[PDB]
Enzyme design. Structure first.
Site, PDB file in Angstrom:
ATOM      1  N   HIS A 127      33.839  27.170  10.602  1.00 18.89           N
ATOM      2  CA  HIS A 127      32.650  26.656  11.299  1.00 18.89           C
ATOM      3  C   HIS A 127      31.883  25.729  10.371  1.00 18.89           C
ATOM      4  O   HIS A 127      31.469  24.638  10.762  1.00 18.89           O
ATOM      5  CB  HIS A 127      31.726  27.765  11.800  1.00 18.89           C
ATOM      6  CG  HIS A 127      32.419  28.773  12.650  1.00 18.89           C
ATOM      7  ND1 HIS A 127      31.853  29.976  13.007  1.00 18.89           N
ATOM      8  CD2 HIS A 127      33.630  28.732  13.254  1.00 18.89           C
ATOM      9  CE1 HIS A 127      32.696  30.647  13.774  1.00 18.89           C
ATOM     10  NE2 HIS A 127      33.797  29.927  13.912  1.00 18.89           N
ATOM     11  N   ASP A 184      27.072  26.658  16.775  1.00 17.15           N
ATOM     12  CA  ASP A 184      28.508  26.616  17.050  1.00 17.15           C
ATOM     13  C   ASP A 184      28.845  27.657  18.117  1.00 17.15           C
ATOM     14  O   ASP A 184      27.965  28.151  18.805  1.00 17.15           O
ATOM     15  CB  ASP A 184      29.367  26.727  15.783  1.00 17.15           C
ATOM     16  CG  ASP A 184      29.150  28.014  15.010  1.00 17.15           C
ATOM     17  OD1 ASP A 184      28.999  29.068  15.677  1.00 17.15           O
ATOM     18  OD2 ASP A 184      29.194  27.934  13.772  1.00 17.15           O
TER      19      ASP A 184
END
Ligand SMILES: O=c1ccn([C@@H]2O[C@H](COP(=O)(O)OP(=O)(O)O)[C@@H](O)[C@H]2O)c(=O)[nH]1
Length: 462
Positions: free
Chosen positions: A14, A110
């Site tokens: 991420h 995210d």
């Protein structure tokens, strides 16, 4: 100039693409960016990554208290709750931004960070999602609230594959890991996040048109409660940064000769599988560069992490037999540089999306060896639809034996089997350059978002 706040959920996969995204925002669009980092403890790998133009700052939140969680908590529950339980500290950061005259123009989370939207909404800041995996899996996420409502069995009981518009068909048994046990909190958190996707003002996805053309076209068609979707990839580290010993070894190998082997930031194999992989890599007689971790019965056991020396798990004589042609590095390698190195010729990958995109940008063909998360979905896309990966055959007990390892490695590196995938990767390497030019489709999509943010900031300030 618009200030963009980015709050990653835990995971190198991420943070890495989010940092590439931030770099494009500051360098190409003149924006400012602050990372707000939630977690359990100090950053690891993480610091190498956050260590950036002045236009990018980082705030590390106090560590969240996850001590109430069982040791058997699945990673997606931990990842999601890290962001959710950080909201009170995120609110404090937002108050500091207000005091400094820099209320963000957007809050970017995210795929597991949607509870931070509570803070965005409280502060009247547009919420966005940066989606670090495929348009195929984004389609699955957008559809999950409906799938959950309409299907009442564990997904492995489905007899027909799911075939969303523009998507490769995927069997229920191959849906991403957190979907495989609907009673577990990991499913509850996956589902909860997906139900919040309709609240996003836009979803930027790290993929590109030529890679997933049918899925992107479907995602961009108007639909019920569906946000605008912007393909902005491939946003990767192109491997031009100065790293050392494994790269020195690589410099000494012939063009296109080395198989890189790596299972992401979090992947491990079982003991038995580690053994067969080592044996089959030796048997193949190919050159290889393998980032090794100690084995585990849990495939993503290194996600958050080694104490033990992984080399102690290798079979008798393996290090000796491969002393010239193989380089085994524990824990972590300079992957971006490896994949961009002219001596690299193939990649046995767990099919994490950053690893896949890095490989695409350098034209390196794949052996798909998925382990956890949505990797099996990615392996199906790569091998059956994009056709840029070979797959090894696992026996009925799940083990890929040494004969199969050697077969698929030789197939990729020297065989007729690997010609098709190598040619497809050549075409995708070109397309990756195309879409990032000033008027390429991924640059146009990111520019539309940045233009929206510049307009929003202009209106607010006038
Ligand atoms: O030894 C390693 C393993 C991973 N990576 C980087 O870590 C990221 C892993 O992300 P991916 O999406 O492939 O998988 P995940 O780690 O999320 O499962 C990619 O950017 C890799 O280049 C690296 O630099 N060295």
């Amino acid at each position: 100039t618009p200030h963009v706040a980015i709050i990653p959920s835990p995971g190198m996969g991420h943070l890495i693409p989010l940092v590439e995204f931030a770099k494009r925002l500051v360098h190409l669009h003149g924006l400012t960016v602050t990372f707000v980092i939630a977690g359990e403890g100090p950053p690891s790998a993480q610091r190498t990554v956050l260590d950036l133009p002045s236009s990018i700052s980082s705030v590390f939140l106090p560590p969240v208290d996850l001590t109430d969680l069982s040791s058997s908590t699945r990673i997606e529950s931990r990842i999601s709750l890290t962001v959710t339980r950080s909201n009170p500290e995120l609110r404090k950061v937002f108050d500091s931004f207000v005091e400094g005259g820099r209320l963000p123009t957007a809050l970017v989370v995210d795929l597991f960070g949607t509870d931070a939207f509570d803070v965005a909404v409280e502060f009247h800041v547009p919420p966005y999602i940066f989606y670090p995996t495929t348009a195929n899996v984004l389609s699955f996420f957008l559809h999950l609230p409906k799938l959950d409502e309409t299907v009442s069995c564990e997904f492995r009981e489905l007899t027909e594959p799911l075939m969303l518009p523009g998507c490769v068909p995927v069997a229920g048994k191959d849906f991403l890991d957190p979907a495989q046990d609907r009673k577990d909190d990991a499913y509850k958190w996956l589902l909860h996040n997906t139900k919040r996707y309709k609240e996003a003002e836009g979803i930027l996805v790290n993929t590109f048109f030529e890679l997933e053309p049918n899925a992107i076209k479907a995602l961009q068609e108007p639909g019920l409660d569906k946000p605008p979707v912007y393909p902005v990839g491939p946003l990767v580290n192109i491997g031009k940064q100065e790293a050392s010993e494994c790269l020195k070894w690589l410099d000494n190998q012939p063009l296109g000769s080395v198989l890189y082997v790596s299972f992401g930031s979090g992947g491990t194999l079982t003991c038995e599988q580690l053994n067969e992989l080592a044996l089959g890599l030796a048997d193949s007689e190919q050159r290889f560069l393998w980032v090794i971790r100690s084995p585990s019965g849990i495939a993503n056991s290194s996600y958050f992490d080694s104490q033990t020396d992984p080399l102690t798990f290798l079979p008798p004589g393996f290090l000796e037999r491969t002393k010239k042609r193989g380089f085994v590095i524990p824990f972590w390698a300079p992957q971006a540089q490896v994949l961009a190195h002219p001596s690299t010729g193939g990649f046995l990958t767990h099919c994490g999306w950053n690893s896949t995109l890095e490989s695409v940008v350098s034209g390196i063909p794949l052996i798909a060896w998925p382990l956890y998360a949505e990797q099996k979905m990615n392996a199906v896309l790569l091998s059956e639809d994009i056709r840029a990966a070979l797959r090894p055959r696992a026996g009925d007990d799940g083990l890929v034996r040494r004969e199969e390892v050697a077969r698929v490695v030789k197939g990729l590196m020297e065989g007729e089997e690997g010609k098709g995938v190598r040619n497809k990767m050549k075409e995708l390497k070109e397309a990756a350059c195309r879409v990032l030019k000033d008027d390429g489709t991924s640059t146009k999509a990111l520019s539309l978002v940045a233009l929206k943010w510049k307009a929003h900031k202009k209106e607010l300030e006038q």
